[PDB]
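Table S5 (text form). Sequence records supplied for joint modeling of the two-component complex.
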Amino acid sequence: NRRDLRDPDRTVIASELVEHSFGVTLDKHVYAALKFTDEQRTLDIRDYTKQVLMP
Amino acid sequence: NRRDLRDPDRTVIASELVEHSFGVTLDKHVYAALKFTDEQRTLDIRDYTKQVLMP
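The corresponding structure-token record, covering 110 residues in total, follows.
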């Protein structure tokens, strides 16, 4: 605020400061799942990494 | 000024030197005052440098 010099009203207006806030939340579960029978893990799956994990 | 050459009216119109002036005045008091109750200073304010002085 601004006031005049040599003013007989020596009143200084106070100032107000207001902080704010906002929330960040964790709300989703992203997953990929597979199931393999032992027959098709022993026989069908050749390179387990390149065939399963990378996809 | 300009006469006519060989004018029998041999009167000379004197000119004037008028110095002008303006004024620069200091007449404003720019402030920013803060009023902190003791409870607010004790509890709410944590740094007072990045929370009061900088703003």
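Note: The interface with chain A takes residues 26-35, 51-52, 55 of chain B (CB under 8 Å).
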